[PDB]
Amino acid sequence: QAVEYACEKGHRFEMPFSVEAEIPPEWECKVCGAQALLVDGDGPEEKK
Fold first, then answer.
1. What is the rounded CA–CA span in Å between residue 10 and residue 22?
2. Tell me, what CATH number does 24's domain have?
3. HEC profile for 1-48?
4. What's the CA gap between 48 and 26, in Å, rounded?
5. Is 11 marked within a binding site?
6. Contact of 14 with 7, CB cutoff 8 Å
7. Alpha carbon separation from 18 to 5, 22, 44 (Å, rounded)
8. Pairing of β 12-15 and β 26-28
9. 29 annotated ligand binder
């Protein structure tokens, strides 16, 4: 149960969210510096 974000740097990272939340389709890249697109955001974090 973790959300997965992928930055335009090419890196993917997971962050803790609510599994009953509407996971934001994009988030700031905590890894390197970019806008990271949320992947598999069906609803639950690790729904996929």
1. 24
2. 2.20.28.270
3. CCEEEEECCCCEEEECCCCCCCCCCEEECCCCCCEEEEECCCCCCCCC
4. 16
5. yes
6. no
7. 15, 8, 8
8. unpaired
9. yes
**Encoded tokens for 13:** 């990272």
Determine if residue 32 is labeled as part of a ligand binding site. Answer: yes
Cβ neighbours of 26 (radius 10 Å)? 11
35 labeled part of a ligand binding site: no
Q: Which domain holds residue 23?
A: 1-48
Counting the structural domains of the chain, the total is 1
Residue 30, both tokens? 């905590």
Experimental method: NMR
